[PDB]
Structures are given as C-alpha cells and as structure tokens.
C-alpha cells in the first residue's frame, strides 16, 4: 500500500478500536457516567483544541466518535492524510478517556498514563527557556536493550525530555535507565494510544503559554509546529495504526524518524538504520542545536588566553602549515581523522605540523574557505594546553606538557576541527608530522590556494570599494577594539582580508564582520570617513570616537594582540622601526617585541605605535600620512629578507628607491640608536631628508 492508504487503514483501525472501547463504557457504566482525565482544566485537550467543546459524560464521549469519522476522508491529497492522522489522535484520546472510565486508576508504575496540568506548567517553562532542548517521543521496540539504553541515555545527556511508549519501556529498564520526571525520562504506556499523553503536553502548552483558545486548531497546530521541539523515533515493525499515529505527529509539525523502510517524505518522515546516528539525525531533523559539542582535555573559550612545552611546531623552528580546501574528489571525503608522521609520544625532550582539511558539502564556495582557516586558530586555542598563532603557511603551534600528561593526541585535533566545522559551517558543509608529506603538500595545494587568494587583492585598490567591513571578534580580550578592514589595510591578525570579511557576513549575517558604508569623506591621506568613525563609536561603546585609517599619530586605529609585526616611532632618526614576533632581541627603542606589544594592543588609541600583519608593510597606505614606508629605518634581518622584493618595488613606485631593503638597518649592522643614525647618514635614507615625523 502507498503512504496514503496505509494511513487511512490505520485511522479506520483506530476508529474501530475507539468504537469497541466506548461500547464497553456504555454497556458497563451507562451514557451518563462522568468522563474526565486526572487534574486537568481542558477536559479532553485534543477534542478541546479541535472543537473547543468539553467532554463531560460517556454519552458526549460517544458523540466525539463522529469527530474521528469526519477527519477520515479517503482522498489522496496531503491535507486529507494529515486530517486522517488527527483522526487517529482523537481516536487515541477517546480510547484513553474510556480507560479512565472503566477503571479509576488504569495506569500503575512504571507507566504514568495521563500527565496532569501541574506537570505541564512545571515542564513548560524550561521548554520555553530552552533548558529542555527537545522532546524525544521514542515508540516501538529496539533490536536489543543495549541499543535502547544507548539512545535514551544519550537523549537524556543533552537535557531532552524522553517519553517512552511500547516495548521500549521494558528495554530501558533492562538496560538500566534511570526513569523519572526529574530524570527527564517518562514511560507513558505500553499501548500505542498512550502516545496521545505527550501530544496533550504539546497542545496544552499552546493553550497555557501560547494563550490560544479552544477551537483555534490551525493556531494550535502552528504553535506546536513552531514552538514545541518534539519528534518521534519509531523503532521495530510499524503497523498501519502506528503509521497513522505518525501522521498525527506530522500534523502537529513533529518529524517522524524510523529504522524501518517507509515512503520517506523530506523533513517529515525519515528512515535511519544506523542506531549510532539516530540521535544526531533526530536533533538535526527538528533543528535542535545542543550547546555542548571527543578529547579528554577541557575545551572552552576560557583557554583562549593561553610551564614548558612537550612539542613545538612552526614559527622559526620547523615548517608547519594549515590549509582548508573545498573539493568533491581527489581523496576520501569523510570524517577521516588521519595522522601521517612521527607521533608526539616519540618525543623524549622539549617537528612540523601539517593541517590539510577537506570539505565538499553543498553550498560551499571556493572563496568561502579563508573564513575557515581563521576559525581553526580559535578551535585550536580552546584546547587546554595548546596555543595557535600565525596565519596559513607561517603558522606557530606549541603543545603543552599537561596535554601530554592528559594523553591528548593529534587525533583529537582532527576531531575538534571536523566537529566544530559541522557545528558552525553546518549550512555550507589530515595531520602530517612527516617532513616529506609536509613539504610536497605545502606547495601542492596550500601555496597555490594562497597565491590565488592573495592574487585577488594583489592588484586591487581601495580606489573602487563602496563599503568597508568592521570586525569585533578580538573584543573578547580588547573590549574597545573595532578592527576596520580595507583591500589595503588588513585585519591586524593578518588573516581576515577585506574579502574574507565579506564572506563572513554572507555566512553569518549577524557575525563579527559587518558592513560599514564609505560615506562622508573628510581626508584621503589620513583616512577619515564620518560613517567609519560612527560605526566604531557604537561597537567600542563610546570609548573610541575619532579615528584615522592611514595614520599612527593622529587618532590611530586601536590594536588588539594578534599582530605579527609592530611599528614604533623613532623621532631621533625622523622615522619608525619594525619588529616581528619571531625576534627575541632588543630594538633601537630599547624594547623587545613583548614590551612593544604591551604598548600597542589592549584596544586603546596609542599614538606613535601600531600593530599590523606582514602584508601591510608593502602597502602604499602604510603610514602614508607620515611619508609611507620611506620612514622604515630599522627592521630585523629575517623580516627584511622575507619582504625584500615586495618593498623594493613599492618603494620605487614612490621614492624610486631601488634598494630600500639595503638602506634599512638591522641587528647585524647595529641596534643602538646612535649607531643606527650613523648608518642612515652614510647610506642616505629618505627619512632623514623627509619632513619632521612629529
């Protein structure tokens, strides 16, 4: 039979069962005997919701059978199927109401039967506040008590209210499940009709909290469908009556998920055979998002801030790299947690760390990946005893001894990444500690992905944007930091680019990267837009009001703490100095990188000093209001050599200097200010012949 005929058949069976039980009540207690459920102000909730009338005597209960008959219309059209399902629900209520007539207390422990109004009040508030994320209506029989207990204990672990009907009650007991109202596991009954006792919880929630009145069936069915997070999990062989009952659950907007082969209806009737996945399947099917998301060590935003290290990877010691690539083939696309290289346990005293992530889910753009490379930094930081800094190819991670003592493994890295990728990028959705694989892969996929990535803003100029993007993700530590981002001024962390910030708004409309229209142009050299200042004032909460985009002295842009390079003013040399996080020696200003960092970040407007990435150095808008890169006087050899051809070309476009890098002083030449100014005079730096910086 098709889904329609199956539902009609079961509804007729439900009516036949309700006619037989009602006859017993008329023949045994008479048509005037009082019919009522224990402690309820809505008589028969289902009938009261559909008709707005109350059933008080057996004669009236007999009349209610015509409601069941009226809802069954054997015509193959959705509405008819759903009404047939509501007929089964009304029939189940009549059967249960009759049970309470023929017996004062028809139910007994473990089964509860009817749920009184005070319980609805007690559970309704946590349901509204979200403390009870969902209502799992488990119905039928599982293959074994081990699978039943496994599922029930899992639903209860997420704070869900589990309701059991059928043989699954006996299985929960046999599998040692703690049952009770406080334990959020309520056994309603062994009969299929006892499912109606949870349906009345949803209907009464609409009448009590929703403030809807009886008879407003469409408004009640809308409240349950949009406000009651319930779903059905039907296990074992399903009869026509059970399928018909499932249509009633679907009529209230509740998805039915079964382990049996049935005519599936997207988002409403589904078939999942893997019991180890039925929980995740049901939570997704009813849009239930759990706050808690496989690693012994703690994971939380508290470990974002930050003893010796067991293993260090990247920085200026080993070649580590991270890469998120979207590709439908080329490799096994799955939660393959794979580690190819010498594990950390091999280390005996204080290695590379390649991280290639592959995701090919629907609605995934090739320019959406960068937003992923950035989030890795946050996921890896939350791991207790692990810290991640640096952006893509230049990445620095230091694993802690405590973690080794915790027995943490690189395996948990792949798990934390995949699990968080599915949680955050749900709508749009391999470690290598071996040198060889790290090498080839570094340039086989990452460098290409990067080069094509940088290529975007490689020639682009701010001369053609109409809106900038403001990020407030660093506001966790710096309460007044509002990072403006431009195709030329990049996010101080070095990762978020004016385009990745654009993709962040597409993915998360209410995320950190928000639009700021470029209006009210005041100065092009200093970078002063009336809207840009205004949007910063709102996020900073009145702390930062006036700001400049291309100036380090006049109202500068606030700094956070993820800057790889710092730029400090050196008035004695009429210029500025630069230092990278890798450098551990003093600078001409008599300060180390860590000392400089404490003078730039904290979300404070600091004139003279600023934090920036490794790309801004070559940018024309770098300190342009102060003379551009011409002011750079001192720089570590390591950074000089890396950004050498990129500075020599941009410098030629401005001061025609062809060997600016050669004119810059470094720790090799000298660090002392007096010796640095002598070297500058010998060569002939433009900064000496430029206007006074301050």
């Amino acid at each position: 039979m098709n889904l329609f005929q199956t539902v009609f058949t079961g509804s007729k069976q439900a009516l036949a069962a309700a006619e037989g039980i009602v006859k017993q009540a008329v023949d045994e207690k008479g048509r005037d005997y009082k019919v009522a459920f224990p402690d309820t102000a809505y008589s028969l909730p289902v009938i009261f919701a559909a008709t707005g009338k109350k059933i008080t005597n057996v004669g009236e209960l007999e009349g209610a059978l015509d409601i069941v008959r009226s809802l069954i219309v054997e015509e193959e059209m959705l509405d008819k199927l759903l009404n047939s399902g509501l007929a089964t629900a009304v029939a189940a209520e009549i059967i249960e109401a009759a049970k309470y007539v023929l017996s004062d207390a028809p139910y007994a422990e473990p089964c509860v039967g009817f749920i009184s109004d005070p319980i609805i009040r007690s559970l309704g508030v946590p349901l509204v506040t979200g403390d009870i994320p969902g209502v799992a209506v488990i119905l039928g029989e599982c293959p074994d008590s081990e699978t039943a207990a496994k599922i029930i204990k899992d639903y209860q672990s997420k704070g869900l209210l589990t309701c059991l009907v059928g043989k699954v009650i006996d299985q929960a007991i046999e599998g040692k499940v703690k049952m009770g109202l406080d334990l959020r596991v309520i056994p309603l009954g062994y009969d299929v009709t006892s499912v109606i006792h949870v349906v009345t919880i949803a209907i009464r929630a609409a009448l009590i909290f929703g403030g809807i009145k009886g008879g407003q069936l469409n408004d009640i069915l809308k409240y349950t469908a949009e406000r009651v997070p319930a779903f059905v999990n039907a296990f074992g062989p399903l009869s026509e009556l059970v399928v018909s009952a499932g249509a009633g659950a679907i009529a209230l907007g509740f998805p039915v998920l079964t382990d049996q082969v049935v005519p599936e209806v997207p988002t409403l009737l589904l078939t999942q055979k893997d019991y180890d996945k039925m929980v995740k399947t049901s939570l997704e099917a009813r849009n239930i998002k759990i706050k808690i998301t496989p690693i012994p060590v703690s994971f939380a935003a508290a470990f974002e801030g930050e003893n010796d290290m067991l293993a260090e990877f990247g920085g200026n010691k080993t070649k580590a790299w991270e890469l998120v690539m979207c590709a439908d083939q080329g490799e096994v696309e799955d939660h393959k947690i794979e580690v190819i290289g010498p594990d950390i346990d091999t280390i005996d005293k204080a290695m590379p760390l390649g991280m290639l992530i592959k995701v090919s889910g629907t609605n995934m753009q090739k320019d959406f990946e960068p937003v992923l490379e950035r989030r890795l930094h946050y996921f890896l930081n939350y791991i207790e005893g692990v810290m991640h800094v640096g952006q893509r190819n230049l990445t620095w991670v230091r694993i802690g001894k405590e973690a080794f003592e915790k027995g943490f493994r690189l395996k948990h890295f792949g798990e934390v990444i995949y699990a968080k990728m599915l949680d955050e990028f749900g709508s749009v959705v391999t470690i290598i500690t071996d040198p060889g694989k790290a090498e080839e892969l570094e340039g086989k996929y990452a460098v290409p992905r990067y080069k094509e990535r940088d290529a975007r803003l490689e020639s682009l100029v701010d001369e053609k944007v109409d809106t900038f993007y403001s990020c407030n993700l660093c506001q966790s530590f710096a309460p007044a930091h509002v990072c403006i981002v431009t195709p030329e001024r990049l996010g101080l962390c070095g990762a978020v680019s004016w385009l990745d910030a654009k993709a962040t708004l597409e993915l998360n409309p209410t995320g950190p990267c928000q639009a700021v229209p470029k209006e009210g142009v005041v100065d092009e050299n200093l970078g002063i837009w009336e809207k840009v200042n205004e949007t910063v004032s709102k996020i900073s909460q009145g702390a930062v009001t006036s700001v400049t985009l291309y100036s380090i002295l006049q109202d500068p842009m606030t700094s956070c703490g993820c800057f790889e390079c710092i730029t400090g003013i050196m008035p004695e040399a009429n210029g500025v100095v630069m230092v990278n996080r890798e450098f551990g020696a003093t600078t001409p200003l008599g300060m180390t990188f860590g000392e400089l960092a404490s003078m730039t970040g904290g979300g404070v407007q600091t004139p003279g000093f600023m934090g920036h990435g490794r790309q801004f150095i070559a940018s024309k808008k770098f300190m342009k209001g102060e003379g551009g890169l011409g002011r750079i006087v001192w720089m570590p050899k390591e950074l000089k050599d890396f950004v050498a051809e990129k500075l020599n070309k941009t410098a030629k476009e401005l001061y025609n200097i062809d060997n600016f890098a050669d004119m810059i002083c470094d720790e090799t030449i000298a660090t002392e200010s007096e010796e640095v100014v002598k070297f500058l005079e010998e060569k002939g730096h433009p900064a000496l012949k430029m206007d006074p910086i301050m």
């Binding site: 098709n2 059209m77 005519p263 078939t271 995740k280 399947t281 629907t362």
Partner: protein, 629 residues
C-alpha cells in the same frame, strides 16, 4: 469577436497598432478566413509534380487515393513525418553551431570554458580523458565527439547517461534507436519522397527515430555545450512583459534562438566605449531585453529582462521604443521588416541561415564575435537619436520572475531537504521521495509557442494553474515559460496563491516557486534528463513514472518534433492545437492509441485546457496505481 489575448499590456498595444494603422499576426489570421480543410486534416500532398493531390479525410466519400495511388493515411503520415524532420533540422543546426563554437574556444579568446566541472562530467559521457590535461584540449575533443553524433555513418552514437537502459533496449526492439542527426533527417526526407514508404505504421516509427536525434542529442548537446561555455544556470531574478522597456534608455531587444550572439551583445553592452556612446546620444544607459528562446537563454544565465513571447514580438515594435531589434534564426516573423518601416526601429538580421528582405543585414562574424556584437549594438545605440518620443507608449506593466532552474540547480536546491546523516547529496532522491509518497501527485512539463487559433497565453495559464492546484509540480520552457513569467506564476508567492496542499508544502521546504522555468526548448532536454534521473534512481523506465508533457498553444514544426520525442521517450503528451492528422484514421489511431503499446506513452489532443488538466491527473493516477504509489 473572440479576445485576442489575456495579457493587458498586449491588449493595450493591440489598440495602438490599430490607431497607428499597422498589421499584426491577429489581423493576418483573420484575413486567412476559413483556412483550407485538406491542409488542416493533412490530406493534401505536394511531394511530386504529378500533383497537387487532395484525398477525402472522410472515409468512403470523395477521392480515395492520390495520382501515385497513395491512400489518405500515407499522405497524412508523410506530411506528419516531414514536420518532425524539419523540427529536428532546426534544433540540429542550433546545437551544431554550439559544438563548432566549443571547438574554437581559447584561454585568451572570446569564447571560453566557463563551467569546467560540467565539461569534465560531459567528457565522461563521450569517453574523453580529463586527467592532467588542458581544459581547452578536453573541450576540443568533447566538441569533436559531439560533432560525430551529427554525421557518423559507421559506429554507434553517444547518448547521455540519464537515459535508462530499459528505454534504450525498448527503442532497439522497436527499431527506432537513433542514428546520426543529419542522417536521420535524410532518411525521413527520402522515405517521404514519391514512390517510397506507403505504410502509416512504418512512417510514424521513422519519424519517432528521427525525433530522438533531437531530444537526446542535438537539443541535449546544445544545452550541455552552452552551459559549458556560457555557464550552467542557477536561481536568478528577472522581470517579464513589455513593461520592461524603458522610455529614456536605449532599448535593444534580442529575438531569435542562437545563444552566442545574445551572449556577446550582453558582454558588448558593458564595453566602456558603448556605455559612453549611449550617454552621447542622450540616454540613461543600455536597456537589454530578450524575446522567445534567445531571451530565455540570456535571462537564465544573466537575468536579462524578458520583453515578451512569440505573438508579442510585433507589439514590442508598436511601443515605438525599440531602437534596435537584433535577430538570428527561428520564429522571427518576416512581418517585422514591413512593420519596422512604420517606426524608427532598426530591424537587424545577423544570420546567413535567416536573411529577411528589407531588413538591415549585419552578419555576425563567428571568428571575431565580441567585435562583431559591438559593431551591431553600436548601430542600435546610434538609432536612439531617431526616436520620436511623442509616439512612444510602453504599457506600465511588468512582472517579477525567478528562473535558472537547471537540473544541477534543482538538485542543489533539493539538498536543503536532505538530512546530513541519511539521504545522499547531489541526487534527485528528494523529488522521487515526494512523488512516491504521494505529496506531489506527479510532474508535468508545459512547453510550447503561441497560436492565433488559441487566445494568447490563455491555454498556457489555465493549464499550468490547474496542474499546480492538483498538487502536480510544473516545469516550463520557451514561450510557455515566458507566459507564466508575465502572469506571475514564476514567483515564490505563487505557491500559497495557486498551488495545492502538497505542492505548497514542498515549495515552502525547498524554497521554490510552484512553476520552475528550465530554459528554452533546446532546454527541454533538461526535462528529459530530470525525468530520466528519477527513473534510474527508482530502477524503472520513464513510461512507469506519473509524468506528462503539454503543448497548449504550439505552432512550430519544432513543437511536433518535441512532442514526438517526448512520447517516444515514454512521456504522455497533450496537444492544445490539433495537428494535421484528422484525415488519416490509421495515423490518428497510431498517435493516440497504438503508440502506448510501442513506447508506453501516447498523444492526447485536447483544445479545452480544463478538460486536459482532468485527463492528465487521471492518467497520472492510472500510472501511479500500476506502480503501487
């Protein structure tokens, strides 16, 4: 007098046409008075100079055979087959031109490979390697293999995978498996020649074999190669109806069927020099509009506003705001040459395949396509200076519409109703699921042109509205799709207003209108692909699914070839205009009865759209019962 159209913008300009004293397709239809009945019944033969001959459509009375001895059923069946051969030829040259363009692609060339993923998948179908090779080397090999299907004399032709093996073996058993495209056209033209085939059953089977070379080959190749070079369509917004024309802008209307010229006129409209030229003549900018299939191809990929469908083309000129009407091939009423003389409009013909006397001829150079399109568009821009703003009248009536529903996009949209822990991704399972469950009673395809015998857009709208009310998802193409775009059915808002309980529910979940626009008629191959994919996923033939095709107001010989391949492919087809078959009792029996026993589907002729909808729903329920769904 019967109403000429249901669209208010069309009726407004028809009054203006009368006041201006100009002729329209409706005026010429009236002038034809009682059209001939031998030609109408299909019993007139002119296949040799011994004729003309005209036998009686009424058996028993009048002349029984032609001068050669050909009975009415022979005459009718030969006339019907020639319509299929001509229809197939029209689509054949269209796709052939696309395949030749694919063969001349270049990295730094005007025509490039925009969708690389699609080309890689298409290469698998033609058995072309796609590993560590230049994309243009793959494109040229795929183009060469595609071109083989037009004239290979030895070996077997390549058909798309969506086509079930059950359907292929059924064609083989019947003797209608497809040969090369042009070769089959020759076979029909040969057997229809005097003194050849004189058996209705054999002739109708030959036409079915020929029609298959249109749907599963030329039209399929034309669509596939177009998506490779110009991009695969995805959901996009556009506006429809003559209200899209702007009085203070340069109105350039693209009419025709070929997509390369239209694609280049779009790129040309962005040339800074041409953008500035539009300002030099005193215009707001360049307002690009489209009409008929060509307009559909550009609106599917670039959202270019749709000015109108087949019978609205003359009325677009009547507004007095069309500065340039650029045309290529297929359904470009020759009347436009004379009509344009009463207005400033420059009627430009660009194809050597379709020369029209008294029209400006600017050949579209396929060697320098962008430069050629820029030179044509420049003439349309300069013509703005010759507009008489006092005689302009654009009806203030346009409509919003969503289109771009290719099979890839339909699948991409269906993935949003699939659990990450159960159903597979990028498959048609969600659509088959609702069809088997019974939420969607079936899926109908409403396609077709417009005919003066039917009130313009009346049958299209009444049929589509009736099918969606009865929970039957509707897919549209060509003038039928444009008719729906103008009325307002191609909107998300149309599901609550006109769709049944099940379809309105599916629309809310998948986030789609109740009517899906899948492109031009060469894009009817997408319908075959989609239905074929469902058939393969359910392990059944196409004749086993509750699907149907409808041509409420057809007229082109292409429509006959379409209908024929749709029926031969296993899908029941309904016709809103009776074809010339009445005079051949055996031919009528074959098309509307015996065919069911040959391909599992048959033709249904129904002029009343309300009766047609009832017949479609009943026939779908019949097929659902046989399948147990």
């Amino acid at each position: 007098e019967k109403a000429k159209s249901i669209d208010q913008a069309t009726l407004q300009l028809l009054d203006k046409a009368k006041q201006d004293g100009v002729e329209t397709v409706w005026d010429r239809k009236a002038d034809m008075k009682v059209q001939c009945g031998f030609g109408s019944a299909g019993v007139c033969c002119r296949n040799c100079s011994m004729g003309p001959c005209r036998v009686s459509p009424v058996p028993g009375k009048g002349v029984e055979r032609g001068i050669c001895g050909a009975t009415a059923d022979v005459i009718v069946s030969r006339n019907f087959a020639r319509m299929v051969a001509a229809g197939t030829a029209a689509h054949s040259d269209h796709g052939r031109s696309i395949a030749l363009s694919l063969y001349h692609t270049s990295k730094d060339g005007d025509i490039k490979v925009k969708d690389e993923n699609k080309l890689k998948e298409v290469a698998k179908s033609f058995n072309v390697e796609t590993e560590g090779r230049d994309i243009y080397d793959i494109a040229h090999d795929v183009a060469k293999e595609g071109l083989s299907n037009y004239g290979k004399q030895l070996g077997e032709v390549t058909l798309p995978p969506s086509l079930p093996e059950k359907r292929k073996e059924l064609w083989r058993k019947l003797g209608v498996y497809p040969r090369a495209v042009d070769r089959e056209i020759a076979a029909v033209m040969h057997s229809t020649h005097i003194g050849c085939n004189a058996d209705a059953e054999a002739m109708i089977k030959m036409s079915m074999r020929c029609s298959l070379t249109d749907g599963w080959m030329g039209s399929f190749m034309g669509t596939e190669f177009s998506d490779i070079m110009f991009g695969t369509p995805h959901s996009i917004d556009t506006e429809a109806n003559l209200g899209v024309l702007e009085k203070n802008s340069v109105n350039v209307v693209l009419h025709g069927h070929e997509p390369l010229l239209s694609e280049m006129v779009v790129e040309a409209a962005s040339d800074p020099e041409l953008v500035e030229l539009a300002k030099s003549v005193g215009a707001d900018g360049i307002n690009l509009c489209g009409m008929c299939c060509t307009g559909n191809e550009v609106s599917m990929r670039h959202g270019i506003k749709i000015a109108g469908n087949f019978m609205q083309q003359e009325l677009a000129v009547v507004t007095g705001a069309v500065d340039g009407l650029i045309v290529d091939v297929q359904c470009i009423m020759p009347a436009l040459a004379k009509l344009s003389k009463s207005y400033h409009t420059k009627f430009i013909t660009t194809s050597p395949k379709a020369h029209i006397t008294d029209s400006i001829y600017m050949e579209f150079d396929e060697e320098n396509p962008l430069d050629s399109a820029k030179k044509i568009l420049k003439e349309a821009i300069l013509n703005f200076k010759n507009r008489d703003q006092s005689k302009v009248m654009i009806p203030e009536l346009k409509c919003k519409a969503i289109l771009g529903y290719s099979v890839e996009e339909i699948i991409n949209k269906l993935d949003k109703v699939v659990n990450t822990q159960i159903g597979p991704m990028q498959t048609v399972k969600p659509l088959a699921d609702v069809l088997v469950s019974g939420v969607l009673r079936g899926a109908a395809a409403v396609v077709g042109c417009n005919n003066p015998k039917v009130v313009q857009d009346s049958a299209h709208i009444e049929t589509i509205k009736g099918l969606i009310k009865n929970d039957v998802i509707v897919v549209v193409t060509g003038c039928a799709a444009q008719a729906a775009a103008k009325y307002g059915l191609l909107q998300k808002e149309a599901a609550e207003k006109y769709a049944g309980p099940g379809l309105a529910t599916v629309c809310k979940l998948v986030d789609i209108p109740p009517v899906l626009h899948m492109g031009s008629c060469v894009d009817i191959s997408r319908i075959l692909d989609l239905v074929g994919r469902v058939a393969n996923l359910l392990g059944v033939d196409m004749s086993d699914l509750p699907v149907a095709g409808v041509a409420p107001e057809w007229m082109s010989e292409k429509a006959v070839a379409i209908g024929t391949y749709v029926v031969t492919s296993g899908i029941d087809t309904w016709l809103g205009v009776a074809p010339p078959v009445t005079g051949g009792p055996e031919v009528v029996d074959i098309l509307t009865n015996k065919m069911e026993d040959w391909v599992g589907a048959k033709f249904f002729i129904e002029t009343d759209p309300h009766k047609a909808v009832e017949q479609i729903v009943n026939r779908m329920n019949e097929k659902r019962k046989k399948l147990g769904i």
